[PDB]
Amino acid sequence: KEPCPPENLQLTPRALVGKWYLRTTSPDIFKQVSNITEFYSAHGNDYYGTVTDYSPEYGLEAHRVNLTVSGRTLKFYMNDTHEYDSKYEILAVDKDYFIFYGHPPAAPSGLALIHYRQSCPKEDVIKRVKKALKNVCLDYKYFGNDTSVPCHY
Ligand SMILES: *[C@@H]1O[C@H](CO)[C@@H](O[C@@H]2O[C@H](CO)[C@@H](O)[C@H](O)[C@H]2NC(C)=O)[C@H](O)[C@H]1NC(C)=O
Numbered sequence: 001k002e003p004c005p006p007e008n009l010q011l012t013p014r015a016l017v018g019k020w021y022l023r024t025t026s027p028d029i030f031k032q033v034s035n036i037t038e039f040y041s042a043h044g045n046d047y048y049g050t051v052t053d054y055s056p057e058y059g060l061e062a063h064r065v066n067l068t069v070s071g072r073t074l075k076f077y078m079n080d081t082h083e084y085d086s087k088y089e090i091l092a093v094d095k096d097y098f099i100f101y102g103h104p105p106a107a108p109s110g111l112a113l114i115h116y117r118q119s120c121p122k123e124d125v126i127k128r129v130k131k132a133l134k135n136v137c138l139d140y141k142y143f144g145n146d147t148s149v150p151c152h153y
C-alpha cells in the first residue's frame with residue numbers, strides 16, 4: 001500500500017545515528033535476507049555506515065551504505081548490491097523506531113521498513129508502531145517479521 005505521509009514531519013538531524021535492527025517489513029522480505037543490523041554515523045545532515053545481514057547464499061555479509069537526507073526523503077545507496085537502493089520517505093521517527101517507504105528494485109511497487117532500537121522490541125514499542133502505521137494509512141497486519149531472530153523461548 002502507498003502510505004498517506006503526514007504533512008510536516010520533522011526529520012531531525014542525527015535522529016538515525018547508531019544501531020538499528022530492521023525487523024519488520026511490508027511486503028515480507030525475510031525469506032531473501034535476514035538478521036539485519038544497521039549502524040549509522042552522522043556526516044552533517046547525512047549518514048554513512050554499515051548493514052550486516054545474513055544472505056541465504058552468502059551467509060553473514062557486511063555492506064557499506066550511504067544515507068543522503070533531504071527534508072523527509074533520503075537516498076539509500078549500498079556499495080556492492082543495489083537491489084535496495086532508492087529514494088525512501090520517512091513515515092515516522094521516534095526514539096525507539098523509524099519507518100521508511102521506497103520503491104527499490106527488490107520491491108518496485110513499494111516497501112515499508114521498520115527499524116528498531118531493540119532487537120526484539122517490547123509490546124509498548126510495538127503498540128506505538130501500530131499507531132504510527134494507522135496514522136499513515138498502513139496496517140501492521142500486512143507486515144512480516146524477521147522470524148529467524150529468536151524473540152521467544
Ligand atoms: C546476526 O547479526 C549479528 C550482528 O548483529 C552477528 O554477530 C556478529 O558476528 C560476528 C561474527 O560472528 C562477530 O565478529 C560480531 O562480534 C558479532 N556481533 C555481535 C553484536 O554480537 C550474528 O552472527 C548474526 N547471526 C546470524 C545467524 O546471522
Ligand SMILES: *[C@@H]1O[C@H](CO)[C@@H](O[C@@H]2O[C@H](CO)[C@@H](O)[C@H](O)[C@H]2NC(C)=O)[C@H](O)[C@H]1NC(C)=O
Nearest residue numbers: 049050051052061062063064065078079080081
Ligand atoms: C562493501 O562493503 C564492505 C565494507 O565493510 C567491504 O568489505 C570489506 O572487504 C575487505 C576487503 O576488500 C575486507 O578486508 C574487510 O574485512 C571487509 N570489511 C567488513 C566490515 O566486512 C566490501 O569490500 C565492499 N565491497 C565493494 C565491492 O566495494
Ligand SMILES: *[C@@H]1O[C@H](CO)[C@@H](O)[C@H](O)[C@H]1NC(C)=O
Nearest residue numbers: 126140141142143144145151
Ligand atoms: C511480529 O511480532 C510481534 C511481536 O512478537 C507480534 O505481536 C506480531 O503479531 C508479529 N507480526 C506477524 C505478522 O506475525
